[PDB]
């Protein structure tokens, strides 16, 4: 695929700033933990840098196109993404197969400021049937994975959602 994963040391400032964004963006959810489980914080086991020259060049090419359409402003954010397809995404990148057809804003690829929102999708839409080992959406044993992603928003359409 061209992807390598580089482990960050817990002593690395990059590990610490990514952990803080993960921990500080947990909130309570309206489902009382049905989809993502009941928790106020995470046990971070590992943070890896995803390195793929081809996928990076694909991202920066698109970022330049957006930027030139928006007064040299990519409007780049760092956002969470939870998906049952996290292992396909890190190897092949995001594409239409990672879209949420039934999402509130139509068939697209959804990202969250709240790490706990992305946590609700790790085991599928609405948490699916939870961890594959115990069938538990609130499993405290099984290892979970989230992506912390660089996202070009450019000119974003504001939808107020009551």
């Amino acid at each position: 695929s061209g992807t390598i994963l580089i482990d960050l040391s817990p002593d690395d400032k990059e590990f610490q700033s990514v952990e803080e964004e993960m921990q500080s963006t947990v909130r309570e959810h309206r489902d009382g933990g049905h989809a993502g489980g009941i928790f106020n914080r995470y046990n971070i086991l590992k943070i890896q840098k995803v390195c793929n020259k081809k996928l990076w060049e694909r991202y920066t090419h698109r970022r330049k196109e957006v930027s030139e359409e928006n007064h040299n402003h990519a409007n780049e954010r760092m956002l969470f993404h939870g998906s049952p397809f996290v292992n396909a995404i890190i190897h092949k990148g995001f594409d239409e197969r990672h879209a949420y057809i039934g999402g509130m804003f139509g068939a697209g690829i959804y990202f969250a400021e709240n790490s706990s929102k992305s946590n609700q999708y790790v085991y599928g839409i609405g948490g699916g049937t939870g961890c594959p080992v115990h069938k538990d959406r609130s499993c405290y044993i099984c290892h979970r994975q989230l992506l912390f992603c660089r996202v070009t928003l450019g000119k974003s359409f504001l939808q107020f959602s009551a």
Partner: protein, 46 residues
């Protein structure tokens, strides 16, 4: 996969009832995101 609204590159879902919720975002081109960090974790029992 749908298109972003005409003249736009993304959609922002602004929290509008839950005062504590942060924004959600939607892109319609896979090229507009790079998966920079893979975080392995457990949720912790309160």
């Amino acid at each position: 996969m749908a298109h972003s609204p005409p003249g736009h590159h993304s959609v922002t879902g602004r929290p509008s009832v839950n005062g504590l919720a942060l924004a959600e975002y939607v892109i319609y081109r896979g090229e507009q995101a790079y998966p920079e960090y893979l975080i392995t974790y457990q949720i912790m029992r309160p």
